[PDB]
Amino acid sequence: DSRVFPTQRDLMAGIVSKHIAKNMVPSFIMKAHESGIIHVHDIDYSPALPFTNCCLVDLKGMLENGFKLGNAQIETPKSIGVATAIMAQITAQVASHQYGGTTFANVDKVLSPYVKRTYAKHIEDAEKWQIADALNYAQSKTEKDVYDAFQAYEYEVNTLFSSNGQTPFVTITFGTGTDWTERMIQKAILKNRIKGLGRDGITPIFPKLVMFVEEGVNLYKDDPNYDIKQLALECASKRMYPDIISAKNNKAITGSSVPVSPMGCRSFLSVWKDSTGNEILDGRNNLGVVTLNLPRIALDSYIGTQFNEQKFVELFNERMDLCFEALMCRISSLKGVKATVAPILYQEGAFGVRLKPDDDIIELFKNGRSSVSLGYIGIHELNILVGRDIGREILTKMNAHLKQWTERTGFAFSLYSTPAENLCYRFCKLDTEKYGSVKDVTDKGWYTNSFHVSVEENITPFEKISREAPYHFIATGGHISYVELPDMKNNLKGLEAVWDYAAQHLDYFGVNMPVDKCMNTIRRTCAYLGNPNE
Amino acid sequence: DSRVFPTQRDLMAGIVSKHIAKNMVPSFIMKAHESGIIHVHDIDYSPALPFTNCCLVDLKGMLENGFKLGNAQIETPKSIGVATAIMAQITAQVASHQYGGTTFANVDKVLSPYVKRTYAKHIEDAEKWQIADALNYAQSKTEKDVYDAFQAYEYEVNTLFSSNGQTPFVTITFGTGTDWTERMIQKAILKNRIKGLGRDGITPIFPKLVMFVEEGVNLYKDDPNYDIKQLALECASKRMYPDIISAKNNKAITGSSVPVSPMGCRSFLSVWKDSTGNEILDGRNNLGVVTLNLPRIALDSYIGTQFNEQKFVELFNERMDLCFEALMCRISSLKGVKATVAPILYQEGAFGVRLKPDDDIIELFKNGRSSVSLGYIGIHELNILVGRDIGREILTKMNAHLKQWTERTGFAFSLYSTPAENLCYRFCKLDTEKYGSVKDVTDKGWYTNSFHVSVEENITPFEKISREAPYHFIATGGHISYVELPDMKNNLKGLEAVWDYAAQHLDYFGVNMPVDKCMNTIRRTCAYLGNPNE
């Protein structure tokens, strides 16, 4: 809410920070942001404080070894219920030290050792109490211990607030686990999600659930986990989540030999290797987002009422540079900042390393370890303004710019399809104060997300999936495609159809359907789940 | 820490609030605070925001009925481990909506129904698996379920941060429970506390542990829970806590027919009844503290180098009024504030009622339900400055003023022995900028806490306890006495001696001893536990 204390204290800190940013960001960058030319995200956090954006938490390396959480020296969990309890405490802590989402990748694989542990204890207890049905007593207890554990993770995520009086934006991914412990975790999460939250079993907005689907594991009636896929479909039909990621396309796009979980909503890392040649994923992050307002480059290049191509070219080049200056300006503020700024992130392992209190954090992000995002929005409205479809082309040229940035600074710049849950209105409003109502651009009040096909089009699901799929291979830093569907609670084979089509053709995908009960109304009209009643 | 993000964001909010307070507090009150005449506590929170101070959480009325925690509608816990998990989530939430400590009173009595529940499940499971040793299988599981549950409460308290990037100031009290479930909870807490936190089993600073000791329950070798008292002694000897409260004296002082737990460190409520004649304790709170600098009234009444009695009288009367104006000024800012400001406190039961989002919260605090604190400090240094012991007398007159305030406004003003962990240095420093080094007053650098006997005196434990005990009956709004003792890990009968003496003579009491391990050094030099190494 906003009338609430934690939110109010946060707004105060936001205000002080926006003011401090005015004294740190070169005026030409602030003026372009104030006017809607670009959008420097999270200015109410950074650069006042050297926060970073989103991340894949290295939960595996923290549970295995131990780590200091506050005053306490936590030790490897002896139980699955203790490892998820700890996962929640880490979720709360990481949320409070970065301003972006937090992702726990492959919880099925990561937490499996603890499910095994729980089992060993129910067996050493099935003989300690000479229990009739031994192997069966374990199977049950363990199963219950695992459901309750994720049910409690899910509950904790929904009650625990950050340092901002907000519920954490956390993402949990699974799907590539085949072992019985890995399968049990997956089912546990899907089952508990269907059950819903609390007495009225309502639909949770967090954690976001993303499932990997790969041939020979998940998508064909013959794979080991095809039954989980079925459960996942039901879940999606009743709670919107999980979204799915195509292991096949995801690996080709990222260059990673293992599926890449999105940090936060949809920010994807590119493949990276440590000094000894190892492919690292967990513990990596993103340094921020600066979004480029694409319709506005077209609008500003109109002469009278017609488009001027030569003007577009000059402005596009001018604005790409501006964006670059904006991303570097804040990355530069990270210089000289010490690991003392966020112990959970830099010292106790969430970022997969152990820096001393006096080590500079900036060194950890260099040479491609961290990604940096150049966002964009409204290809649909840009196409309309320039007379034709330049979607794939503008993005391709943006990437060529990004490659040069990467080679000059060492940071791994990528193209990001900004979720823009609110930026979609903000850019449109600022452009409207200058151009008024422009048919099919600023007239509906918002811009279309990244490269998505406008909502006003009457596209068949497969067409939409097909018209959007190539963007998943161009905007490698972050992307997703949605399809609108009616209630499919009783048409799972239909939803599986859409899933299988998206899975083959694109990367990250999700389905928007209506999900209401005797009054708990949820819709995903943009990026997050929400009640469009308020 | 301070270099840490959550702390930094908080400092920003603190700054904005101190500035806002400058525009809300009458200048004469700010000037008296800036000069050390009085100390308006928590100005970095209130009155910028209508926060309240400390409280006794009505956990009983929240677990019994249900309540909304965020989005979720939590239901009565079916297990003890689920009720303590929930207790932690409530602890985190309440901490974020008030700026003072939070107390869970008589957790032994309150949580007992859930321990029973856990038992019923291990029995209905001892037959479901035709377990040999039935009643014995329950006894064990239940016992383990209960240890682990409080161990996890204790851990969560130490990892969970508030909206301020701080660990919550929470107090847990027990001791009057006799039932086997009540005893089990107590032992669980004492046992887990001795065990310590984390791998190195270090000493927790929170939760504070306070135990009631009453004849025919706790203190004589013949009472049911005398063995818990023994355990408590061991605990105190190894972890400083628990402190104890004399049920006998506590009830006579508070006027309550049941022992009164301190909200936060040592703030005690006076007896109060609802509209139907019921004695309410749980869900009640305190509206703030304004501390009066006693040495400074004496100092300002010196003429040249000698005390001037007539001047003292005039200043004391002038400053009491000033204090009153300071307490009312902030209570007045609570007018018109809606329950939407803190749902967990006002709507979902932590304050024992259910206000609608649009109800004013101020009505809930009136006619004695909430206490309001007039603090004071340094009787020792005041006695030195006025030539004789006026301790008991000045306090008695303060109370006569408080009674008049209570009758004119309806709020229940009480005399509070400010913990002043830092105020003790601040008042001394501000008085030193004006008077320099004054032998036995401002020369050591700090003032002595409330009515405590100076540390520089060489008093026997019983003497100290005896010289201080009468203050517990005068400063009813908050008080405590400490005794310094050597290592008593191997002299428990000695510590029990001190305990029994304090128990008979005063109210709330604690013992400071050294508590170190292969380097985890803890001391309570003032109010809280801490490492005097930094």
Curated annotation (Swiss-Prot), chains A, B:
Subunit record text: Homodimer. Forms a tetramer composed of two NrdD and two NrdG subunits.
Location of the Glycine radical domain: 457-534
Protein name: Anaerobic ribonucleoside-triphosphate reductase
Top enzyme class: oxidoreductase
Residues that hold dCTP 1 according to the record: 39, 41, 420-423
PROSITE patterns: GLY_RADICAL_1, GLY_RADICAL_2
Annotated positions of the Glycine radical modification: 527
Catalytic reactions on record: a ribonucleoside 5'-triphosphate + formate + H(+) = a 2'-deoxyribonucleoside 5'-triphosphate + CO2 + H2O
Species name: Enterobacteria phage T4 (Bacteriophage T4)
Residues noted as binding dGTP 2 in the record, renumbered to the chain: 75, 78, 121
One GO molecular-function entry: metal ion binding
Binding positions for dGTP 1 per the UniProt entry: 39, 41-42, 422-423
GN (gene name): nrdD
NCBIfam families cross-referenced by the UniProt entry: NrdD, PRK09263.1
Regulation of activity: Activated under anaerobic conditions by NrdG, a tightly associated activase.
Residues bound to dCTP 2: 75, 78, 89, 121
GO BP annotations listed: 2'-deoxyribonucleotide biosynthetic process; DNA replication
Amino acids binding dTTP: 75, 89, 121
Chain positions recorded as dATP binding sites: 75, 78, 89, 121
EC number: 1.1.98.6
Similarity remark: Belongs to the anaerobic ribonucleoside-triphosphate reductase family.
InterPro entries: Form_AcTrfase_GR_CS, Gly_radical, NrdD
Binding site for Zn(2+): 518
Keywords: Metal-binding, Organic radical, Oxidoreductase, Zinc
Function: Catalyzes the conversion of ribonucleotides into deoxyribonucleotides, which are required for DNA synthesis and repair.
